[PDB]
């Protein structure tokens, strides 16, 4: 899903 991409970007940024 496209609307999940913006969440994946948050992961590797903060994880």
């Amino acid at each position, epitope marked *: *899903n496209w*609307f999940d991409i*913006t969440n994946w970007l948050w992961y590797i940024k903060k994880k």
Partner: antibody
Amino acid sequence: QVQLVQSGAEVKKPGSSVKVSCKASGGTFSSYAISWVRQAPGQGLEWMGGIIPIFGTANYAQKFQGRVTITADKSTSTAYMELSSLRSEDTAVYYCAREGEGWFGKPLRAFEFWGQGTVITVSS
Amino acid sequence: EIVLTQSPGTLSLSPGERATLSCRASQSVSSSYLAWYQQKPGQAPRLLIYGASSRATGIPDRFSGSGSGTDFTLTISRLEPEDFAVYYCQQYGTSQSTFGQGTRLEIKR
């Protein structure tokens, strides 16, 4: 917090093209998707497309493919919506929305932040 | 892709009464990716519920979301004069986001 300011109203002719801007203010700009939603007089909401500014690739609605170009200018923190081959049915209020920001940086997917809306009148 | 149908079309309720709006989907919505928005005349849509049931920031707890898959429900427990407007549902379980035709909630007198 996040604020979205759109450009003024516009009056276009059938067959021409129109371009609407959306200047964001506050928070992060690269890693948050900006979507565009139109609404005709008396009708309802309609999703047109979105873009994640950190990527040049966008995501358009299959109905509008061939007429919608959504590009983001990170240098000015401004999203752009462009519609070509205008027809009278395109006469609507064009809102620019941004996904919601939850606890910490974890983003939501619904449209929490919105602009004031641009009245695009396609007539002759 | 997914066609959302909102019910009923128009709803006439008095302040203090209980409100229930239904949003049915032609197919299953992935991960309950359903959102409810409110829009008043002349203004922009205001987010109420995201994730089918999670409440947005600054929204009173009298708004409650329920359901999943093909049927979702927005419930307004006690109605107030500032709760009468148009309500939309929106699915974002697929890359092609879509909205409902709208449910207007007016005042009964």
